[PDB]
Amino acid sequence: LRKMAQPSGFVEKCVVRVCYGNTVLNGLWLGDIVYCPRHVIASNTTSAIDYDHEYSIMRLHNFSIISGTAFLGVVGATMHGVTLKIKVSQTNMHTPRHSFRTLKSGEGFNILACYDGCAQGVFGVNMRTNWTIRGSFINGACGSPGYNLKNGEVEFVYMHQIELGSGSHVGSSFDGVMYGGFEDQPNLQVESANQMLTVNVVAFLYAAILNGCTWWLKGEKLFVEHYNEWAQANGFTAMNGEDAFSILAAKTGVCVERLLHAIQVLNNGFGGKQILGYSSLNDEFSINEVVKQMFGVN
């Protein structure tokens, strides 16, 4: 069981460099629009930014947009939430089939980490319950896109915006809505406490059974409402959609509630043993990742 990214080839062709005055970051070129964070036009980030004022003084000739080696001709730019839509005169002939989607709590996606208009890394990640992610971004990563591949099309779900004081990372949907409601402002912002994604830990243990790792499995069941009471006080999400696990419960013969029991126990530590090579419960893998990696089903 390995955490994988979906391939990045369709997305790489859309990444561009967006320069405005004294700032450089990344943009996403789809059709004749380049999407990027609006804070690229902020002329002074020492203190609170009045983005209406910044937009009113914005001058189109201060933009430079580069795709690989070619300059794109900027013809207009409008502000939408915390993003800019920059109209260029060239159409990206490598625009993939795509849509835009806003992630829900816990949902998996892929980050293409880009610098200077060029992709440098790719990884799978989950939107955490506090609406941040643990990216690896350093300065210059803003505008890096997050995406999912689904039925032959690219769902664009994340545009990188800011790093919080804690080191956690916040982006926006491509509608311009910042995840978690955080502001593109210079001052300190603090995220809510993270919660372990219970549905993913369940999938993790099903994966463990399927690979023969069963030293932790016991016959006792913990009822869902009894588990949810425990979760609320111990930093775990509640259990929902138990039906979703039916394919895994059938193939293993282990009901969900026996794994809820194991979570409550295994949270106190593994005692030196390892589950699939991990020394603590892992919440990285969704049910769909587990069935895909072990069976080839989507």
Per CB under 8 A, residues contacting its own copies are: 1-9, 12-13, 112-113, 115, 119-123, 125, 134-136, 138, 140, 167, 211, 269-270, 272, 274, 277-280, 293-296
* 47 scored as a contact of ligand FHR (CB under 6 A): no
Number of other residues whose CB lies within 10 A of the CB of residue 136: 12
- Please spell the DSSP secondary structure of 15-67, one letter per residue: EEEEEETTEEEEEEEETTEEEEEGGGG-S--SS---HHHHHHH--GGGEEEEE
For residue 61, indicate whether it is catalytic. no
* 7 scored as a contact of ligand FHR (CB under 6 A): no
For residue 39, indicate whether it is catalytic. yes
Indicate which of its own copies, ligand FHR, none lies near residue 47 (CB less than 5 to 8 Å, by partner kind): none
Q: Is 10 helix (H, G, I), strand (E, B) or coil?
A: helix
* 191 scored as a contact of ligand FHR (CB under 6 A): no
* 185 scored as a contact of ligand FHR (CB under 6 A): yes
Identify the active-site residue in 39, 98, 160, 169.
Answer: 39
Compute the least distance from the CB of residue 280 to ligand FHR, in Å.
26
What is the 3-class SS of 94-117, one letter each residue? Answer: CCCCEEECCCCCCCEEEEEEEECC
136 or 246, CB closer to ligand FHR?
136
Contacts of 79 (CB under 8 A, 6+ apart): 38, 51, 55
CA distance 241 to 262: 18
Indicate which of its own copies, ligand FHR, none lies near residue 272 (CB less than 5 to 8 Å, by partner kind): its own copies
Compute the least distance from the CB of residue 81 to its own copies, in Å.
27
Compute the least distance from the CB of residue 105 to its own copies, in Å.
19
Residue of 137, 158, 227, 245 that binds ligand FHR (CB under 6 A) = 137
Residue 89 DSSP label: S
CA distance 161 to 144: 8
Pairing of strands 153-163, 98-100: parallel
Residue of 12, 32, 54, 163 that binds ligand FHR (CB under 6 A) = 163
Residue of this chain nearest to ligand FHR (CB atom): 142
* 106 scored as a contact of ligand FHR (CB under 6 A): no
Q: Report whether 50 contacts 39 (CB < 8 A).
A: no
Q: Which residues of 218-235 are buried (b: 16+ CB within 10 A; e: fewer)?
A: eeebbebeebbeebeeee
The residues of the shown chain that bind ligand FHR, judged by CB under 6 A, are: 25, 39, 42, 45, 49, 137-142, 162-163, 165, 169, 184-186
